[PDB]
């Protein structure tokens with residue numbers, strides 16, 4: 001049960017859940033390379049989400065909805081995390097490290113680039129830890145769709161569960177900071193600082209979607225995710 | 237310097253800073269037919285903007301920033317601030333958005349403007365969420381000031397720039413402390429305090445989202461040569 005895990009068991013489950021770092025397939029279509037990278041990461045994000053404690057307790061519908069809302073925020077927070085020790089650069093993959101003026105190739109990409117670097121600098125200033133990072137990523141998964149669901153009794157029960165798991169991750173975040181020797185005030189301050197960054201990740205994702213949907217296939221992402229989440233039980 | 241206020245002094249100063257509740261400019265003898273909602277909401281929003289500027293200048297730490305940084309923070313945050321206000325004053329009216337005391341709308345009347353009902357539904361749910369959390373006015377004013385200080389903080393490398401960011405974050409830390417204090421006085425346990433802080437701050441990300449979609453919806457309508465930065469500066473000259 002996801003709600004009976006301790007803070008240490010929670011951190012431990014999220015670390016264990018971490019997806020692998022994938023590699024990119026001169027400047028070809030840089031958008032080609034990045035889209036191919038994202039598509040391959042999506043698969044591993046599905047496996048990952050299924051290991052976030054609480055997630056597989058939800059309906060298939062709500063699982064898809066959550067990933068459809070959060071997929072870019074999740075990709076972005078991973079990017080920001082990887083790029084943390086590389087100032088002025090975004091490590092999309094170990095073999096695809098781009099700087100600002102490489103961004104000025106796709107129109108509109110520069111604005112998003114600058115925002116991503118700034119978040120990465122912020123994580124670096126705060127010395128964000130891996131254990132904290134995985135907590136934030138899981139919050140993104142669980143939080144980003146919750147407000148834009150139906151309100152059936154089933155749907156109400158689903159929303160209550162999500163808020164219990166989010167409360168457990170908060171618990172876990174606080175436990176980490178205490179385990180790291182911060183004061184209670186410092187803990188509350190750091191918790192606030194990190195959750196406010198989630199607002200900026202949401203903002204970037206929204207601008208990202210605008211940018212991506214400005215470039216005009218017959219395979220909608222919803223359908224894509226459903227197909228991937230809706231696994232059979234034949235391969236035991 | 238704002239860094240030396242207590243929680244109650246911070247709480248009290250924000251309460252003191254609260255803007256008034258404006259009304260919709262209404263010919264109430266006139267039919268509702270010959271009256272576009274968007275016009276009413278635009279005129280309401282413009283008049284609120286003036287008061288928002290007055291409020292912002294009384295948020296502790298705000299006037300310590302440069303004029304350039306004050307304008308930028310308001311530039312990024314103004315619609316979120318309008319939204320959180322609408323959500324707060326809509327709490328006691330389930331399924332309805334109190335834009336002004338003489339302008340209460342439901343989802344149906346939202347449907348009259350093309351891409352509006354998406355945003356109404358989102359705003360309604362935010363209002364429902366605040367109602368189920370029993371959000372206090374003391375907490376509300378803290379959240380509203382966090383939006384002001386946080387929303388443009390990443391979109392500003394001069395020595396002054398770093399110092400300015402640094403200052404904004406010290407004040408945010410101060411308002412965080414104030415929120416925890418208020419939850420302590422309400423009788424919440426330490427666990428319950430940090431959970432509630434989290435829950436409240438996670439709602440800020442949904443308010444940002446709604447703000448982003450509101451902006452898409454507004455620019456799908458009107459296409460300003462005069463940038464918003466210039467207008468926010470000019471307003472400070474027009475009415476101050």
Ligand SMILES: Cc1cc2cc(O)ccc2c(Oc2ccc(O)cc2)c1-c1cccc(O)c1
Nearest residue numbers: 034035037038041075076079109208209211212
């Ligand atoms: C911001 C961002 C982060 C990414 C992180 C990844 O781990 C992988 C790809 C990323 C990525 O490119 C994508 C390209 C196509 C697509 O369907 C999904 C992502 C972007 C990105 C790049 C340029 C423009 C844009 O709006 C968004």
Ligand SMILES: Cc1cc2cc(O)ccc2c(Oc2ccc(O)cc2)c1-c1cccc(O)c1
Nearest residue numbers: 277278280281284318319322352450451453454
């Ligand atoms: C969401 C919202 C909240 C408002 C809160 C207020 O206190 C006053 C007006 C509001 C308001 O209408 C506006 C109209 C013009 C404009 O320049 C700013 C706001 C909206 C709103 C409504 C429908 C579409 C949209 O994009 C935005």
